[PDB]
Structure formats: C-alpha cells, structure tokens
Ligand binder design. Structure first.
Ligand SMILES: Nc1ccn([C@@H]2O[C@H](COP(=O)(O)O)[C@@H](O)[C@H]2O)c(=O)n1
Ligand SMILES: Nc1ccn([C@@H]2O[C@H](COP(=O)(O)O)[C@@H](O)[C@H]2O)c(=O)n1
Lengths: 228, 228
C-alpha cells in the first residue's frame, strides 16, 4: 500500500515509504507528493523517542530520502491497536460517541490476514495462531508503555493521541521488538484546541488536504518547516 | 425470540421456552411444535448435571410444561462462547476448515447489544462496560469448567460438543451465576460417527427436520422417547 521492503542481508532490510495512500480495504486510492518523506521522517522521530525510553524498535538508521534501515524480524501476524479516545471502528463495538474519552486505554488485537480482512481476535485465537499468552502479555505491556510515552510527548505539543496501530516481531534473541511504522497514516492525531484530524482521516473522509495536515504535525513536532 | 420471562418476586422468575425459532439476526423465522418442551427439558438436565459438579446456576425448579423457575440476577450483558471444534463464525476469524479440532478451547466474549449486532469484545472493552478483569477471569474459568463437564458427559453418549453459548449474572451475594439456557438452540452438537448436526444448524441451513434432530439428542441423553 504505502511502503516497500528491500533485503540487505540476514540482519537488516530497507523500509521505503511511498506516496500512495489507500483506505477502506484499498477501495479508495490516491497519491500525495511528499507523503512518503513525511511518514519516513515522523517514524524516525517516534522510534528515536521510544528507544530513549527503553522501547526496543527495529529502527537502525536512515538510507536517504524515504528509506529507513531496519532490523529483520520474525513478524507476528498482528496489528495491535491502542485507543484513548473513541473513534473509527470502536464506535461500532461500543455505544459511545466519537470523542468519548476512555476511562483507561483499550488494546485490540487484529489478525493480519487479507483473506479474512484482518478480523479482531482475542488471546485464545492468538494461541491457536502460535502466539503464547506470555508473548501476548509482553506485547500489550509494550503497546501500553508506547501509548504513555507518545500521548505525553504529543500532548506537550498540542496534539491528542486518539488511537494508533503497532506491529511487532521477534529478533534472534527471542526478544519482542516494535516494527513497521509510526506515522499520521497509522495514528489518529487531533488538535487539542479544535479537535480536528491531523492524520489519514483527512484522506479517509475528505476533511481537507492531507499533505497540509501531515506538514502541520511535522512542524508542530519538530518546530521546523518540512524540507523534502 | 425463543423464550419469555415472567416475574414472581425479587428472588425468582419464570423462564418459559416457546416454539419459535429465529436465525441470521432474526431474518429467518419458523415455529416448531414441541421445541419449547425439548429445550426446557434439556436445559434442566444440563443445569442439574452442572450443579452436581459444583457449578452455580440460576435453576431453581420446574413450573410445568415449558416453564422453569429460576433465580433473578443482575445480568452481565455478555454472550460467552466456548469452542472445541471449528464451525460457524470462527471460520471467518481463523483460516481453518469446518470440523478442525482445536488444540485447546477458545473462549469468545460478545457484547449483548442489538443496536451493534452483538459485536465481539475483549477484556478491555468489558472493563469500559463496567466488568472487572477479576469478574471476566471468573466468568471464563466457569465457562471452561462447564465445557469440560458437558463435552465429557456428551462424548460418553456419542455426541461431540462442537461449541456453545453461555450467559451469566450476579446474585445478591455478588457471586457469578450461570443463567439463560443450555439447549440444542444454544450449542452445536454433532454425531460422533457421522459428524451430522443435531442442533439449530438443521434449521439455520435446512439440513433436515429440527424436531427430529432435537428428539434424537433428547433420546440419546435420557434414553427415553420424548413425552411432550
Ligand atoms: N490496518 C490498519 C488498521 C488500523 N490502523 C490504525 O489503527 C487505528 C484504529 O483504526 P480503526 O478505527 O479503523 O480500527 C487508526 O489510527 C488507524 O489508522 C492502521 O494503521 N492500519
Ligand atoms: N446469540 C447467539 C450467538 C451464538 N450462539 C451459539 O454460540 C455458538 C457460536 O455461534 P457462532 O458460530 O454464530 O459465533 C453456536 O452454538 C451458537 O448456537 C447462541 O446461542 N446465541
């Protein structure tokens, strides 16, 4: 959809961010010039923040342009979703309005499977998929810690971390390592004052110009205007 | 759909089993003469078996015909599903065939909510709904024990307990008590030899005559032909 993966060797690979955007199970599609760059840069900033906080990520370095060098891992077939504020699919699962502030974070597990359109699963389904209760517990522990770090950091910049999606794999030591990306593609970010979307929802629901929203996040996070 | 509830006082009520059957979010409907009687009788047999095994149920007694006297409870808004063999909706959640024998039982939680069409939930959604992790753990512990007792009992009668749904509430002591019904409406039952459905799937998928299938379960469980 929005990224490619180039092998280097056993230890590492390239993760390239493309300008393509898709939504609604890729039934909606557009290209946004500079999106790749924005999403690459923001992933790096977030990975570096998490690393300083003692979160193990796959981030190794940058390879110019929209390319990151990342650790190769045995990927878990999961999308791990952490939610602070009601939005998106949660409205179809709990009878609560968009914008409802949750009493505590919700963690949701989704089975990465295109044939089944990524259905939500629980710990028992995960076990049948070969993922132990210990592993699931470690995964959710990390996700919730990531949540705390990102939401605090972003709030001190005028942004509500509404929800976000993470992916994980295992390294050669058997350690659980945070993978994939962290960007306005994979998070919901709302302005603290106006509650307006500064993320992929701008594209999903035609709420304005996506590049404009993604630049605004970047500027608010870095304090600099996007170079490209 | 298939049952009514008549108040008696604070302590108890009547649960009446009707001949109505519905499926596919009540878009399919029929009436089966004697179904109420069968489902009433079988619920009683199962509740009595579980009670002997130290499971707390709402079963108090029989009130003639298709009526049970049951303890009044503060109902949890849950449908608790235990699965031993792949069937039904599980095929849309895990890429496994109908009839796959699971390595261990799966427990699934569904939020009872007609507006949302009973969506599956996890422990975090349950907490937002006011159900503590301790309560959810006690509920699943009971469900899995119920599974062991029923599947053993039924296997010693030539029936595979494929999956089933339970409901629970709290009594005045704050204890978690098994409620609603246990019947061929709320379980999948397969013949051990032929793998054929002796349950509501006969109605769901026009696999034969429902009353015939429900009688066969009853006869195999009791050793007697249904009196009515
Ligand atoms: N495949 C997916 C599914 C959800 N997500 C993200 O997870 C969060 C939850 O999305 P839903 O409300 O669609 O479940 C959103 O921030 C969304 O962008 C994602 O980045 N990739
Ligand atoms: N509302 C519901 C949903 C499921 N069930 C039962 O739970 C089991 C799982 O059903 P699904 O495969 O439809 O999830 C089946 O035995 C079905 O009869 C029920 O008795 N009432």
């Amino acid at each position: 959809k929005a990224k490619k993966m180039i092998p280097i060797d056993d230890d590492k690979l390239i993760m390239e961010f493309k300008d393509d955007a898709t939504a609604f199970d890729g039934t909606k599609k557009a290209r946004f010039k500079g999106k790749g760059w924005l999403n690459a840069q923001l992933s790096v900033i977030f990975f570096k923040l998490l690393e300083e906080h003692g979160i193990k990520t796959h981030f190794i370095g940058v390879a110019g342009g929209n390319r990151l060098i990342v650790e190769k891992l045995d990927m878990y077939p999961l999308e791990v979703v952490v939610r602070n504020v009601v939005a998106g699919s949660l409205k179809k699962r709990l009878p609560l309005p968009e914008g409802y502030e949750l009493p505590e974070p919700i963690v949701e597990l989704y089975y990465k499977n295109d044939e089944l359109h990524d259905p939500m699963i629980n710990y028992y389904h995960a076990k049948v998929l070969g993922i132990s209760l210990d592993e699931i517990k470690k995964i959710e522990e990390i996700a919730l810690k990531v949540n705390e770090i990102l939401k605090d950091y972003l709030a001190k910049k005028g942004i509500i971390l509404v929800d976000f999606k993470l992916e994980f794999g295992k390294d050669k030591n058997g350690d659980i390592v945070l993978a994939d990306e962290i960007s306005p593609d994979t998070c919901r970010f709302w302005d603290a004052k106006t509650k307006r979307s500064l993320d992929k929802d701008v594209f999903r629901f035609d709420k304005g110009d996506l590049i404009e929203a993604y630049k605004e996040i970047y500027e608010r996070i870095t304090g600099e205007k996007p170079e490209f």
